[PDB]
Amino acid sequence: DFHPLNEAGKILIKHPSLAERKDEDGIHWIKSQWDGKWYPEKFSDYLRLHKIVKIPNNSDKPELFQTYKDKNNKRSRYMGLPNLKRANIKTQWTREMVEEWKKCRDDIVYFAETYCAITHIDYGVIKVQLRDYQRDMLKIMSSKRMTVCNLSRQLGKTTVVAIFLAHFVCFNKDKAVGILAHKGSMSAEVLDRTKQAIELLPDFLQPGIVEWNKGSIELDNGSSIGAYASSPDAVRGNSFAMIYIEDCAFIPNFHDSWLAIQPVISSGRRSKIIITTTPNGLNHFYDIWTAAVEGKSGFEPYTAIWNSVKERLYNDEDIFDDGWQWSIQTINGSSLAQFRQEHTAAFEGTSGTLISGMKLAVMDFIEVTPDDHGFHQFKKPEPDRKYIATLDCSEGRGQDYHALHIIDVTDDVWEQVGVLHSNTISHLILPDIVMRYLVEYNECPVYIELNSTGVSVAKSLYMDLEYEGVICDSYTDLGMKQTKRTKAVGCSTLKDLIEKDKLIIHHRATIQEFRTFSEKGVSWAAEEGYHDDLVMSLVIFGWLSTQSKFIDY
C-alpha cells in the first residue's frame, strides 16, 4: 500500500512519476517536490554540476593573497603551527586585497564558497561545497540579528554554523562570541569546527591568533569564541556580541538560562543570537519557534530536513527519485517514529495544524444549499448589523477557488454569516457577483487579497462598479498587500480568534480546510491534494482584525 511515510490517507511524499519533467542541455531533468528545483535524472550529472574545487598549496607566492599562507616561516606561525599565524603581524595591504577582504566582509556566501575549506586526503585542501539549505542559513544568520533554526538531525549543520562563526570573528573587531550547549563538550566540538575553518583561511583573511585551545580562541583583532555548557552563569558573567545556542531544545532547566539571555538581546545591549536545534516535544523551544513563526518574537525562523541533503534524492541505481527509496530504506532498518524524530523536525505532542485538533473537534457546522453561484448563506442579513467581507481570489481556477467570507462584526463575538466558494466563476464577472452579496449585507465593506486576480477585482469593484466599501491599506493598493509578515500574523490572529471563540465558523468546508491547513515550515499551507483558499481568505480577516480601522467597519 502506502510508502511508509504516507501512513494515513495523507500524502507526505509524491512518487517520482508525478514530478514535472524538462529536457535541457543534453540531460533529462526532474523537478523536486521539496524545493521546486530542477535535478538531473542521472546522479553522475549531479556530480559534474557540483564538482570539487581544489584550493592550491601556496607558501611560495605572497602575491597570490587569495591562497597565500606563510606556512614555512616559523616566526610568522603561531606556536610553530603551519596553518595558524602569529598575533600582531602587519599585513601588507594592496588595493586588491582591501577590496577582496571587504567583499568577504559583507558577502558571507562568497566568503563561504571561496575560502572555507576542509583538507581532503585525496585532493588536498578543497573548497567546502555548500548546500542550498546552508546557503539559506548563512544569509539569514547574517542579515538578521535574531535567528532560530528548526532543523532535522544528520544535516551537517555544524559545517555552516562553523563558517558563520568564523566569518563573524574574522571580519569584526573586539567581538565576543559564546557558544552555549547542553554539555560543554558539545559546544567545544562546534568551535573545533570553527577552528577547522579558521585554520584553512589565507593569511589576509586570517586574523592572528592570541589564544587557541579546546574551550576558547582569541584573535589579534579582539574577537573571541568561547565554548560553554549552557548556564545562567555564563550569560550574565560575560559580555557577548554573539550567542549561539547549540541543540537548544535538549537543554534541561533552560528557563533561567533563557531569562538571563533576555536583557542581552531584548532592549537590550543589542547583540546577535543564533539558535539551532532539532525539536523536542512541546518544551520551551516550541514556544520559541511558535513566537518566531507567528511573528511575535523578533526571531527569524528557518527550517530544513532530510531532503536538503540532495544525495538522498538519488536511489541505489543512481537515478533521481526525489528521496523515494532512501526514505523507504531509512524507515526500514529503523522506525517511522524514529524517522520523524531524526529526519523531519516535527514536534511530538501535536500535529502541524494551525488550529489545534482539540478545537477542530468541537467545531460544529451549519449545512446549507448554495446559490447558482458559490454562495452559502448561514444567517440572513439583518438591519443595523455590521458585516465584514474578505476575498481571496483564485488565479488559478483549479488549481484553486475564489473564497469570500462575510463576517458579522456587530457583537463581541464575530460570526461567519456567508461564504462564496467557486472555481467556475470567471474573474471578469466576479466583481458584480460579489457586489450583490456585499450590498445584500448592508453595504458590506470588503478587504481583497491583492494577488494578480485580486488587484483586478479590486479595480472593478471600487471604480467600474463604483462600490464605496472596498478596504485598502493605501491608494495604490486597493486591498491587502501580500507580505510574509501579514500572512504570518494573519495566521497568528486567526488562530487566536478561532480558539478563544471570538470568531465562529459555520462553513463545513472551511472547517475541513483548517483540518489540513498545517505546518509548512516556516509558514502554514494545505498539504498534498488539499485547498487552503477558504482558510487563506480568513487569514486576510485575521490580519484585518489587527488593524485600527477595523475597530469598527
Under 8 Å CB-to-CB from 54, ≥6 apart: which residues?
Answer: 123, 124, 125, 126, 127
Give, to the nearest 10 degrees, the angle between helix 284-293 and helix 254-265.
30
In the bound state with Na ion, the residue whose beta carbon lies nearer, of 369 and 474, is: 474
Shortest separation between residue 404's beta carbon and Na ion, angstroms:
18
Exposed/middle/buried for 145, CB within 10 Å: 0-12, 13-18, 19+?
Answer: middle
Total number of residues binding Na ion (CB under 5 A)? 1
Residue 471 interacts with Na ion (CB under 5 A)? yes
Q: Stretches 58-66, 233-241, 465-473, 490-498: which one binds Na ion (CB under 5 A)?
A: 465-473
Residue 470 interacts with Na ion (CB under 5 A)? no
The kind and range of the H/E element at 471 are: strand 470-471
Question: Three-class SS of residue 209?
Answer: strand
Shortest separation between residue 11's beta carbon and Na ion, angstroms:
41
Q: Stretches 160-168, 406-414, 469-477, 511-519: which one binds Na ion (CB under 5 A)?
A: 469-477
Q: How many helices (H) and strands (E) does the chain have?
A: 17, 21
Shortest separation between residue 407's beta carbon and Na ion, angstroms:
16
Q: Stretches 245-253, 430-438, 471-479, 530-538: which one binds Na ion (CB under 5 A)?
A: 471-479
Shortest separation between residue 487's beta carbon and Na ion, angstroms:
20
In the bound state with Na ion, the residue whose beta carbon lies nearer, of 5 and 478, is: 478
Shortest separation between residue 4's beta carbon and Na ion, angstroms:
51
In the bound state with Na ion, the residue whose beta carbon lies nearer, of 305 and 471, is: 471
Q: By the 8 A CB rule, do 488 and 494 touch?
A: no
In the bound state with Na ion, the residue whose beta carbon lies nearer, of 356 and 547, is: 547
Q: Stretches 240-248, 305-313, 466-474, 490-498: which one binds Na ion (CB under 5 A)?
A: 466-474
In the bound state with Na ion, the residue whose beta carbon lies nearer, of 325 and 442, is: 442
In the bound state with Na ion, the residue whose beta carbon lies nearer, of 180 and 448, is: 448
Q: Which residue is nearest to Na ion (CB)?
A: 471
Name beta bridge partners: 179: 227, 244
Residue 104 interacts with Na ion (CB under 5 A)? no
Measure the CA–CA gap between 139 and 108, rounded to whole angstroms.
7
In the bound state with Na ion, the residue whose beta carbon lies nearer, of 1 and 468, is: 468
Measure the CA–CA gap between 492 and 296, rounded to whole angstroms.
9
The angle at the Cα of 339, spanning 315 to 158, to the nearest 5 degrees, equals: 85
Tell me: cis bond preceding 396? Omega within 30 of 0 counts: yes
Q: 191 φ, ψ to 5°?
A: -70, -25
Q: Stretches 23-31, 138-146, 470-478, 498-506: which one binds Na ion (CB under 5 A)?
A: 470-478
Q: Stretches 50-58, 253-261, 293-301, 467-475: which one binds Na ion (CB under 5 A)?
A: 467-475
Measure the CA–CA gap between 418 and 285, rounded to whole angstroms.
39
Q: In the complex, which residues of this chain contact Na ion (CB under 5 A)?
A: 471
